[PDB]
Each structure stands twice: as structure tokens, then as C-alpha cells.
């Protein structure tokens, strides 16, 4: 229910870890 913390630019949300992490470009 509680909305996850928004990831800054350069990060995105990884459901596996329930946290923001580094996230590169999808191709």
C-alpha cells in the first residue's frame, strides 16, 4: 500500500530489492 520512494534521475525502482538502484539505458 505505501507508495515507494521516488527514484532520482540515474536510478530506477527494482522490485526484487524493494528499492531504487542505478538504471542504465534500455535498448
Amino acid at each position, epitope marked *: 500500500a505505501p507508495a515507494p520512494t521516488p527514484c532520482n534521475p540515474a536510478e530506477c525502482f527494482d522490485p526484487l*530489492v524493494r528499492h531504487c538502484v542505478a538504471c542504465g539505458l534500455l535498448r
Partner: antibody
Amino acid sequence: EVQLVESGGGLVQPGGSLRLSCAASGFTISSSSIHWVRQAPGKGLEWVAWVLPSVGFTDYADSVKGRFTISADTSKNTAYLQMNSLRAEDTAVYYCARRVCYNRLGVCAGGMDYWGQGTLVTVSS
Amino acid sequence: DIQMTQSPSSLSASVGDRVTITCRASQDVSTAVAWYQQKPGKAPKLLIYSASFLYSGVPSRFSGSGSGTDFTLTISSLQPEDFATYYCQQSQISPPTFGQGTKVEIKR
């Protein structure tokens, strides 16, 4: 380029303990999850643990939970696996791996792209 | 926890054959399945991530599909160097459990 250099393998007594290290280059481990996977002789791949070092979050397979402790040191850019109360069934090649993530609509599209060379742990007297 | 079931356990297929390996999840895992190739006693190799996306460098003859529960790794034209054990892994819900594997042998 990315490199994960493992160390600390070897032979140990049943009940004994051992510490694997997984030293990283070419990226910062704090922003990524580091994972341990292992292969017992003549068995499938078995995921054992992960750590998200930025905050120190962890998760464990039931098979190892309460005996192994995964951790990381951000300044040394290295992750660890402390293994205690070892048993014959822990005899395996232990690999460490990085989970890479790519941004797909705000969430991680990822998998384990870079891997250490794997280090043999033999539990036996 | 979530269980990944691969099929078949193993197979034998000729150079040039299309090879289809299936991988099923006990629960809905979105598209968060990866496919890995492992040569004996060596580090596994990431082939596909997020169900259908190709990891840079991987030969184009490997492809993946599916979402939710049913996933498939396809090798369009089997080459001799492709014998290995192929594993699917889901990373939607921790713990990220592997499937049993599928050992591909080259028929000749």
C-alpha cells in the same frame, strides 16, 4: 570494463566457517545489488543471497538462512559472504554476480551480467 | 516463494534445428524473467533479460518471449558451440529462484 574478483575459497571442517570476498571494478557496488550463486557437484544453479550495499538490505535462500551472512563495504567496493556451520551439502563452486538494471517505464529490467570466476568450497574433514 | 519449472529437463537437437525451451512460474511475475547459458564448470552467461530483451553482444539466434506465467527461450538455428545447460530466473519477487535447468546436447 567491469570485473568482479572473488577470493577466500578453500577447504574447511564440517561446522567450520569461511569468508568469500567479491571485489569489484569499473562500477560502484553501492548502487547495485550483489548476488551469490553456487553449484554443488552434479546439481543445478542455486541462488543463495543478495545485498543492496547502499543501505545494507539483504535476502537469503531458506537453505542458507541463519548460517550465512552477506554484507558489503562500500569504500572497499567489495561484497562478502561469511559462511558458518558449514555442511557437506554446502560443498560447491561459489560465484558472485552483479545485477544490472535498465530503465523500463521507471522499473528495473535486469539480470546478472557480470560474474566472478567462481571459487571452490569443499566441506570435509 | 515462487517456483520456476522448465521444460524439457533435457533435449538432443541437430545443428540447424530450432530449439524451444519453456519456463513456467507458479505466480504472475510480469516480464521479469531472465535466461542464462552455462558451459560446464564455468560462470553462467546472461542471454536474455526482462523476458524478450537481448543482452548486448549475444548472438541474434537467441530470443525470448512471454509474460505473466509462461516464458520461452528460442534458439532459431542450433550451432555446435551451443550445448550447455540453460536456466531461467525470475526477479519479480524475492527470493529470485532459478528453474531446474535444461541441458541441451547436440545430436549428430
